[PDB]
Amino acid sequence: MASTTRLVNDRKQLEQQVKDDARILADARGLNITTVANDSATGGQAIRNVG
Amino acid sequence: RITEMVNDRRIMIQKLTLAEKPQVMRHVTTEINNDLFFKMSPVAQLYIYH
């Protein structure tokens, strides 16, 4: 049990830190939403009256 | 009325929007129910067979 047994955990922590500090410097820009539309209807059979 | 006549929970009737509730339709003069079918009993056997 030496400093070599901590290598995998060291890599786990290093990957977490790399992701975290690459998220900080990444530039973020808003995007335009162009998908709004009322196209989600439902079908079926009409309940026609009889008489 | 359609919900009352169809007591089975499996069939779901389309929900009405807020704008579709006050809309006006035309219904039948008298409803067809079991009483109408009861009076057809004398000739009902031929209908069942065919």
Q: Does B32 touch chain A (CB under 8 A)?
A: yes
Contact (CB<8Å) A51/B14: no
CB-based contact A51:B30 (threshold 8 Å): yes
- Eight-class DSSP state of A3: G
Contact state of A49 with B29 under an 8 Å Cβ cutoff: no
Query: Which letter does DSSP use for residue B41 in this model?
Result: G
Provide the 3-class DSSP secondary structure of residue B20. Answer: coil
Q: How far apart are CA A15 and CA A21, in angstroms?
A: 10
C-beta separation of A48 from B28 below 8 A: no
Å resolution of this model?
3.1
